[PDB]
Amino acid sequence: NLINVLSINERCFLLKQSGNEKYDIKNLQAWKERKSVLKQDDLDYLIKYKYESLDNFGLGITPIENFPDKEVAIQYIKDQSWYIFFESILDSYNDSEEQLLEVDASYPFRYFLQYARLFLLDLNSELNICTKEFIINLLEILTQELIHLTSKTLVLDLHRFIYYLKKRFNSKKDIIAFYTCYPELMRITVVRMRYFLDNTKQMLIRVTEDLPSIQNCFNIQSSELNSISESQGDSHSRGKTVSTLTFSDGKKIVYKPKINSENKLRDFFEFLNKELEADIYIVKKVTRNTYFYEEYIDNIEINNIEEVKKYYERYGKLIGIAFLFNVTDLHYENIIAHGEYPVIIDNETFFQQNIPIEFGNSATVDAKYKYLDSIMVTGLVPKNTPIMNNEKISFISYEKYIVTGMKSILMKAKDSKKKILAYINNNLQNLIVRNVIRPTQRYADMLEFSYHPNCFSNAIEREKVLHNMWAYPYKNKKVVHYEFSDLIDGDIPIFYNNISKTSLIASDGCLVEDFYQESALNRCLNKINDLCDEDISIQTVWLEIALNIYNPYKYINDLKNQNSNKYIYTGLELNGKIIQACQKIEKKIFKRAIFNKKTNTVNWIDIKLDQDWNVGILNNNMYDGLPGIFIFYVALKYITKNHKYDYVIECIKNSIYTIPSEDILSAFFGKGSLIYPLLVDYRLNNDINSLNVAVEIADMDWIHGHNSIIKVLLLLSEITEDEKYRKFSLEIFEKLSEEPYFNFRGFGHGIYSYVHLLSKFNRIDKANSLLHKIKNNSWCKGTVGELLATDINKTIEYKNKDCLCHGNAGTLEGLIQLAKKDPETYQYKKNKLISYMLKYFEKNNTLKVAGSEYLESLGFFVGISGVGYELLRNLDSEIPNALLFE
Ligand SMILES: Nc1ncnc2c1ncn2[C@@H]1O[C@H](COP(=O)(O)O)[C@@H](O)[C@H]1O
Ligand SMILES: [Zn+2]
């Protein structure tokens, strides 16, 4: 069975050498149809670059006994370094059974364990650097590795436990029998064995050589290692693992056998402490070329509440620092709370770049990049909790201090651009950092699957299980060859990067050139160079949202606007003030616009509400999405000008047409929300095209319900004469019950929207019957709702909100109406409201809407696009009343 250890390439080679090439073909078909997530392109990639061709692969897949020249294949296997090493381990073993530990289930590996023990004894007799306890610990670690590796195989190799171990593993040949039964388990076992011996020997030689520096740096009096522990299953670069080492005086260091730049990082942190008052805890290290030793950092108790505030401020600072220098993979679980200091113990992932995954080329995926450029990607934003009187102190009621910590770092750094940029260029151009290009858990899962008895019975089978790695959407898949090589080798893949280059350094030191397009160094220089108040502001929002302390109105509530200052504008100068205000609104919108020059698309990042407030990208819903901004530019075009706004309205149409949206039958949410604004675009400007698109969509309680969609359907009939729509809505309205979906008393979220439909479906009087059987201020609930469907001074009063949905612009629609029905009573009150809104606009340089500084809601119903729209309607009533869709 030994020939089953052969890999596809190895099988392919021997067959060619056997004077053979015509492979069965039938088993290629048997392989080609198996459950796989590999797409055709993936398969094409793998077949060509891992194997020469599809023929070779077909040849390399030949099963067991169908194999010619078995002896010459066996001789090939027996010539392999790992096979020879397996022989030596078997032949070296000794009959005695009285020295090595009896805490068992490790019976199967006693051969490996003894061989490891004698190797370690011989080594220490030379080095004199550890004790017998330490060697005991080392063997437990090897034992646990072999246990874990072979366990899945054990459970099925059955088909009280000591009986099977006694039986199945009793003699030399009987152990050879189990390993020849699973010859891929045998190969990897010996591979892991060799790694274990080499890494331990290498470790012990390093500690012996580095000892005077270790003693001096860490104030350790002892000259002998006594204990090794905490060896996480996370191994890299030929079985290398982090370990905690305890000396015979009880003092501990952490051994990290990793490529590193710890000396540059220390000088960097010191710079940051001086320049940015970063107050980073500097962890003591003895740094060497391809490894380092680190100070053992424990979770020491914090003394008082005054220190807890300091702790969480410092935490906010670390977040600011992580943002500024593109830190990823930090993980807030893993911070060590060292008294009043949060301590990072892994800092190998500064200066990162986005993984070159495949994404579309729209403005709306480019908009996704700004999240990947935020505080959220650092790993630091929710042994890591401070502890006071055996009590864990979470961030609850300390959120404020984290926010302040972060803000102060970002503000100070903004003022220190040139010093930061000069440091980086002076000291860090060749920084080597790690890149996690695929999450560890994915790699871990893959490895476990590859440990299936079926993978261990036939290398070919293990190889195929790993073939799945080729499914991942890397732009450059040349990297997967290296992941595969770590994983068959039994390791988690690991990659490094010099921050000024665009290549990846693979686990064996090989380069993958042109992996990145821009260097990590430049990405950070620019972020630093470009750092502005707007960025600080959005990072504060992200954070406050994450800490669950975001207030959508905090920003407007905290403005000081005085009492008796500024007054009512005259008819003529009020028109001049409206246009200026709409230009201010447009410009606020454009400044936050994300353009993609390539596809002529645009999108925005904005704070939006969906049960909670979250930062998001604008999608196709009327309430707070892209149709909102669309209709506003439409209206602004109706006046003037063509230029500027043409090359933006196209971009907006491109996005709305071509993004993940619904087919839903609704006038809010999904492509069905695009109807009205397209009709309005048709009715105000020429554009048949918007009407063309408008009709295409149509073929497929007011908010959230159907009421609104019924209403726009009627608009369609009207503009196209085609009564297929009026009947469409009739059907829906006939089954639509009389009770409102919500108990509120308004339009959109109450009974008044239903009312309006009846007086559109001709059937008045019976509309008045509901108006009869019942007998704040907003359009959505409240009286402006009631007003527009059909105590005036209450409903027309100024409020400290400006939006359409439940603010002054909605009130302004009520006034626009009343002042048409009765100019003498209302034309002045109307101009009063407009003037108050414009005056506060001017003074505050913002409108009274949800959001934060530099980040006003952009939406139609709660944002500034609707306010601009309403203001424009006042200038020309040809702009229809969107509030009830006309
Ligand atoms: N300098 C250190 N002090 C204390 N514990 C550490 C240190 N470095 C690593 N560890 C621990 O060892 C494990 C991490 O190894 P690594 O992921 O390579 O940093 C975690 O469980 C840490 O708690
Ligand atoms: Zn509302």
Author numbering: 3 to 161, 178 to 400, 455 to 772, 787 to 861, 871 to 885, 897 to 992
Paste lines from the article.
To investigate the mechanism of catalysis, we determined the 2.2 Å resolution structure of CylM in complex with adenosine monophosphate (AMP). The structure of the ∼110 kDa polypeptide consists of two distinct domains, with an N-terminal dehydration domain, composed of residues Asn4 through Pro624, and a C-terminal cyclization domain encompassed by Tyr641 through Glu992. As in NisC, CylM contains a single zinc ion near the center of the toroid coordinated by residues Cys875, Cys911, and His912, with a water molecule completing the tetrahedral coordination geometry at the metal. Although the N-terminal dehydration domain lacks detectable sequence similarities with other proteins, the CylM structure reveals that this domain is architecturally related to the catalytic core of lipid kinases, such as phosphoinositide 3-kinase (PI3K). The orientation and stabilization of the activation loop is established through numerous interactions with the LanM-specific KA domain, which is itself held in place through interactions with the ‘capping helices’. In the CylM co–crystal structure, the bound AMP is located between the two lobes of the kinase domain. The phosphate-binding loop (P-loop) is composed of residues Ser247 through Thr262 and is considerably longer than the equivalent feature in PI3Ks. The adenine is situated in a hydrophobic binding pocket common across other structurally characterized kinases that is defined by CylM residues Val272 (Ile831 in PI3Kγ), Val301 (Tyr867 in PI3Kγ), Ile354 (Met953 in PI3Kγ), and Val361 (Phe961 in PI3Kγ). Inspection of the CylM structure shows that these four residues (Asp252, His254, Arg506, and Thr512) are in close proximity to each other despite a separation of >250 amino acids in primary sequence, and that they are situated in or immediately adjacent to the phosphorylation site.
Cytolysin is produced by many clinical isolates of Enterococcus faecalis and consists of two post-translationally modified peptides termed cytolysin L and S. Cytolysin is a member of the lanthipeptides, a family of polycyclic peptides that are made in a two-step process involving dehydration of Ser and Thr residues to dehydroamino acids and subsequent addition of thiols of Cys residues to the dehydroamino acids. This process, catalyzed by the enzyme CylM for cytolysin, generates the characteristic thioether crosslinks called lanthionine (Lan) and methyllanthionine (MeLan). We describe here the 2.2 Å resolution structure of CylM and demonstrate that its dehydration domain surprisingly has structural similarity with eukaryotic lipid kinases despite the absence of notable sequence homology.
